From a paper:
Type IIA topoisomerases (Top2s) are essential DNA-manipulating enzymes ubiquitous in eukaryotes and bacteria.
The asymmetric unit contains one protein subunit bound to a 9-bp DNA duplex, about half the length of the palindromic DNA used for the preparation of the dimeric Top2 cleavage complex. This conformation may thus be taken as a crystallographic snapshot of the DNA-gate in an “open” state during the Top2 functional cycle. Similar to the structures commonly observed for the Top2 cleavage complexes with closed DNA-gate, a divalent metal ion, coordinated by the DxD di-acidic metal ion-binding motif of the TOPRIM domain near the non-scissile phosphodiester between the −1 and −2 nucleotides, was observed at the so-called “B-site” in our structure. However, rather than remaining coaxial, the helical axes of the two DNA fragments in the open form reported here are found to be offset in opposite directions by ~20°, relative to the original G-segment axis. Thus, the sliding of the two subunits against each other, plus the swinging of the two halves of DNA-gate regions away from the structural dyad of Top2, both contribute to the opening of the DNA-gate. However, as the channel’s bottom opening is narrower than the diameter of duplex DNA, further widening of this “bottleneck” region must take place for T-segment to go through.
Numbering used by the authors:
A (entry chain A), B (entry chain A): 452 to 596, 603 to 615, 625 to 702, 707 to 1111, 1135 to 1201
DNA sequence: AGCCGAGC
DNA sequence: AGCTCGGCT
DNA sequence: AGCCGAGC
DNA sequence: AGCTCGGCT
């Protein structure tokens, strides 16, 4: 047939074609799983073809984009479909190579997404097939203990095995699935108007706001459900397209917003936060290859997606070039991308390295980890719902992402202006308004209207024939500008003749210099029309979707950055008071511990009590009879949810030496003074300390950057 | 010109061609290094072309192999050479695009090898060029502190930087090298007959035995030199081909034998031993990807070669299929290759894992590490000159390798027969003779003549038309046998008609079953001529080169395996006596330590001495005045090349509790009894213990293998 | 001519 | 990638 | 139409 | 690889 990745059913194309089934699989490992699953006998009436991934959404797409799509036309040639053909009459179905499509995907949410896009494809092009049951799915278990086809069903029911993707199952497993097909095969049924309404609601861009309402209800409902203790409702026999869209695809849509839409608190997405948690736990003193760090992240954070997406998450986190990260929390040791190509010139993750910026733990103090809520994946504690940085990182690095029904775009903001605004609010004033600010951007950004800005590079008149372009607007890449602006100006086009006579390039990996030559008259005309407009050095920047998850995990639209700043500020200063409470608890327990250590050893050297030959039971009983406390640090740590004095009896015999008692009394007095000194500090003073340290290191680091 | 990897000199092919120089580089990183080194001005008269690696040796090679060699014809087209053309007359040199070839390689030995093969190429095809100085080299530094062009020069001279390959130097470095070319450029000169004699000696297979004598002298000389303290002689101005061959290439030849020819002792090559040392130091409880283990080996063992060669070293170490390793010291967790394709079907090192066999440390006991001599790379201690296994592993896994002037081939041998021979020698008898034995090989191996054997698979007559082939001779691969034996028998050839009517394949990944169908008369004729001959189931195995490095590092040829066995036996039992000496030293120091601990604490509880408030100096002085020994373990460990009693004073206060004194007296008596019990054991009893444990685990492991 | 394997 | 190097079928 | 990025 | 998803030029 000409498609090498396809294994065609023996009876496909023959007089039995209508009884044949094409199995569309997610990935080629699923392909092999199904192939071995059917074996010799299954090969007659069952074809199997792989899909690379998410497919084209054909409902709104251009004609050229559809006609040039390799996968779509592969499925068309395999099944024998013809565009605009309706299938009712026997004469019409004589032309099909297969009578059914059985989609086999993972039992996770992205699988459901592929299911939905295939449903949308068939529903858009051939409703004649969709109404009559041309489409089926082959479900697999996500967990076993007997089999369970969704995590809520297994949780409600409650050796346990978790199945990540179809490739995890193998060998006999696959064959087992294909011996009993009554349980694993589910037919999509068309009930009526509700089905069409549901499909178009999911896959049409006219329905975006509808999707918003859709998802909103879901979120509220589930939270309300979660509040009242009602169990999660789950699927998995016939399944109507409506019930699929609203009870299954919807969880992909919500999971898509949850992974794609950052938190207001730390400005992170679950993947990024997993990466940073892993880095925090490893605490590498030396650089680590991005591929190896990626695998380590996967192990330690329980990151269940593919390695490529995570490696590029890391790369995106490390990028320091103009227009990317105002503060990069990972160091880009390697080629991580440049201003020239916009980062697309980054070297392979196998050949580049990274590690924590020395500002990372200054922005996310280690002690604050004791204030967070760490989540769990199958009894493995992984990473918190959020970190709580000393300043609103969601504003600094310009968080963005694309979900379903909502998207998020924020531009960057100067760290020092944000630090100053936090200081203003700590001193009881109102914050100043803030325009976006991009580190090392030499151009201007000026406020046009509400949430709209003009971003302009720099261009100068050198002389009558010469202009010098020293800056391009933020996110305009050097190579792209050359190809799409200066080169068309120089060579001219069909409609537009040549404006400029020549140009030359003086660039730095981090900077832009163009020297353009024009005729006298044509420069005069260009500056009459204005230089930034003619040379395309002004772009509009409009942020009307700032969508973030607040500290409750609720999606919220913020109209101004000052709202983000205030909400963050309240939360963060609350957590600073929490940090003081925790610190007086911990330091207080430590000081009591040091005090009972000192009393014990001071009485041993003073001769008040002798430990020699005392039985363990008799000694512990005597110690509790003499008033010694039990391990105040372990007791206070356990209290946050036999008597242990080991902290006293595991001390060295060196303890009773004169300089050990001396240094231990000094430690005791010093810890007491530490508790008294921190007790008199306000939480705001704690915050100001953190901010001062952060700016000291920020000046050192950025001046080292400019010197290098 | 059509070669994309080439950067051609601007003046190449023009009227200045004779003044142009083609730079042949080792690898493309060297190519880029030279490109940036010449810059804009250098590009006019200097071309640069990369070589993949070692090139074809054209002196003895087939005509087809030469005419089809891509690199050779690339250099010919680039320079403009013509085979059989002599270059003297001006008319003849009018046809060359370049006047000189400048070879730029690494300053290590393999670079010298490439230099030699280019010299051999030009000398073979065009002596007219070689006599007149057509060839130059561009040397680079191997180390800096000023620059040094060989490690012996730098050692004799003695921030220090070591240069591994040309790719380590970069940027300004390269440009520096090409600003001063008087120091870095060296011209090869043809003195006379000595040069030709030297080149042919190196590169001709008629000269193998000559090379042997050659290398022998060198080895002896250097050892003699090394014995008398005379410094190593080094090179690096003109260099004659003779002086190059005998003073430079020769060190590649010797290094090639040292890496390619295993030791008699542990049966390893430096790379393999580095791998196993790394595994021993990591002590992985879980599997590790072969790529990651490879990188870790590189870091910890100071392995200076490419990652591919090391990853395949690991793969070769893990292979358990019939005809590879009788005992695989690494576990093949993945697809590491099968009997079918001979291991060439192994999966990529990124997708497969390994770890230590549970017999690894039973064959190489950890305590024996204290008896070895660990080498050093730039102050980093890495791995021993050899390990000392409990049985001669060089016989078990069938060590082999190809150097210069010598090669090594040994077949495998049964572990249990070797263990039994060692037991025989420990009981004072002579060893039995041993034929080669391959684990899980169902065929036969029979002695023909001295060091020659017949290896035969298994074939049976089922009935008049049918024969069954259940075994192929060792190292004959299933796929290869099918393609080159059964398929030609079935399809016939131009000369030979078809002997067999059909065949079918019943194979297991680990086993071979062929059922062949023939005519009655033709089976009769085949068994008349014999079934093993007709069906190519007998191969000859001749081992007349068994070449190993003895325990002195001297190359030695062994005529029989019994010589290997005896030499190993003497060395190993010597090291068992050493192990007893070391063990009574260590256990004796431990027992003294426990005794002074017990005396101290027993006198503290008895009240004989009080430590409370005593000054550190006063206490240490009193302790040495009262007879307490100083840290016998640290003193005895230091003796193998202020007073420290910390081992007594860092004890817990729990020490003075009644059950701690009780268990400590029990530990003391138990260690004394341990010293007395091991003192009465012979070294042979130690060896027999090791052998018994090894066979217990060997039976458990191999029975688990057959069950799985 | 091809295979064996540590190297380029 | 296609090759080295020596022994051997 | 294309860009932005975590996913397939 | 070529695609999703929403906002915006
Ligand atoms: Mn999945
Ligand atoms: Mn960004
Ligand atoms: Mn090298
Ligand atoms: Mn082997």
């Amino acid at each position: 047939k000409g498609i090498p990745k396809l294994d065609d059913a023996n009876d496909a194309g023959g007089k039995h074609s209508l009884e044949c089934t094409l199995i569309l699989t997610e990935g080629d490992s699923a392909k092999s799983l199904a192939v071995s699953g059917l074996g010799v006998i299954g090969r007659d009436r069952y074809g199997v073809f792989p899909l690379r991934g998410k497919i084209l959404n054909v409902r709104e797409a251009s004609h050229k984009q559809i006609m040039e799509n390799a996968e779509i036309n592969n499925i068309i040639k395999i099944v024998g479909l013809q565009y605009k053909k309706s299938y009712d009459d026997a004469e019409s179905l004589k032309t099909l190579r297969y009578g059914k499509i059985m989609i086999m995907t993972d039992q996770d949410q992205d699988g459901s997404h592929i299911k939905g896009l295939l449903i949308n494809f068939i529903h858009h092009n051939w409703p004649s097939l969709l109404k009559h049951g041309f489409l089926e799915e082959f479900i697999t278990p996500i967990v076993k203990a007997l089999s369970f086809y969704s995590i809520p069903e297994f949780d409600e029911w409650k050796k346990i095995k978790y199945y990540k993707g179809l490739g995890t199952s193998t060998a006999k497993e696959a064959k087992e699935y294909f011996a009993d097909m009554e349980r694993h095969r589910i037919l999509f049924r068309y009930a009526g108007p509700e089905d069409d309404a549901a499909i178009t609601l999911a896959f049409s861009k006219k329905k975006i706001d509808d999707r918003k309402e859709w998802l909103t209800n879901f979120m509220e409902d589930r939270r309300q459900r979660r509040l009242h203790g009602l169990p999660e409702q789950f699927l998995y026999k016939h399944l109507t397209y409506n019930d699929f869209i609203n009870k299954e695809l919807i969880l992909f849509s919500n999971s898509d917003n949850e992974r794609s839409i950052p938190s207001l608190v730390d400005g992170f997405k679950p993947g990024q936060r997993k990466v940073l948690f892993t880095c925090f736990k490893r605490n590498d003193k030396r650089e680590v290859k991005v591929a190896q760090l990626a695998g380590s992240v996967a192990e330690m954070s329980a990151y269940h997606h593919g390695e490529q997406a995570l490696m590029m998450t890391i790369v995106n986190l490390a990028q320091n070039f103009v227009g990317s990260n105002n503060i990069n929390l990972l160091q880009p040791i390697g080629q991580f991308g440049t201003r020239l190509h916009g980062g697309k010139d980054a070297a392979s993750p196998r050949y580049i390295f990274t590690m924590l910026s020395t500002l990372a733990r200054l922005l996310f103090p280690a002690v604050d980890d004791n204030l967070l809520k760490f989540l769990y994946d199958d009894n493995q504690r992984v990473e918190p719902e959020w970190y709580i940085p000393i300043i609103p990182m969601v504003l600094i690095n310009g968080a963005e992402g694309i979900g379903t029904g909502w998207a998020c775009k924020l531009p960057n903001y100067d760290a020092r202006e944000i630090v100053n605004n936090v200081r203003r609010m700590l001193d009881g004033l109102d914050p100043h308004p803030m325009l976006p600010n991009y580190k090392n951007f030499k151009g201007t950004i000026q406020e046009l209207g509400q949430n709209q800005y003009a971003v302009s590079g720099e261009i100068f008149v050198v002389d009558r024939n010469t202009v010098e372009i020293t800056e391009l607007p933020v996110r305009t890449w050097t190579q792209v500008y050359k190809e799409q602006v200066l080169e068309p100006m120089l060579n001219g086009t069909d409609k537009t003749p040549a404006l400029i006579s020549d140009y030359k390039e003086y660039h730095t990996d981090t900077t832009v210099k163009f020297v353009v030559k024009m005729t006298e008259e044509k420069l005069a005309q260009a500056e009459a029309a204005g230089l930034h407009k003619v040379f395309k050095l002004q772009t509009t920047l409009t942020c009307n979707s700032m969508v973030l998850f607040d500290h409750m995990g609720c999606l919220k639209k913020y109209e101004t950055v000052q709202d983000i700043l205030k909400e963050f500020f309240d939360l963060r200063l609350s957590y600073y008071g929490l940090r003081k409470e925790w610190l007086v608890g911990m330091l207080g327990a430590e000081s009591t511990k040091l005090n009972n250590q000192a009393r014990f050893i001071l009485e041993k050297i003073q001769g008040k009590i002798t430990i020699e030959n005392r039985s363990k039971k008799d000694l512990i009983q005597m110690l509790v009879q003499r008033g010694y406390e039990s391990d105040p640090v372990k007791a206070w740590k356990e209290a946050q949810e036999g008597p242990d004095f080991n902290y006293i009896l595991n001390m060295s015999l060196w303890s009773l030496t004169k300089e050990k008692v001396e240094e231990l009394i000094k430690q005791r007095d010093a810890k007491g003074r530490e508790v008294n000194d921190l007790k008199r500090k306000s939480p705001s003073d704690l915050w100001k300390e953190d901010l001062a340290a952060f700016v000291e290191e920020l000046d050192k680091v950025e001046s080292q950057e400019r010197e290098d």
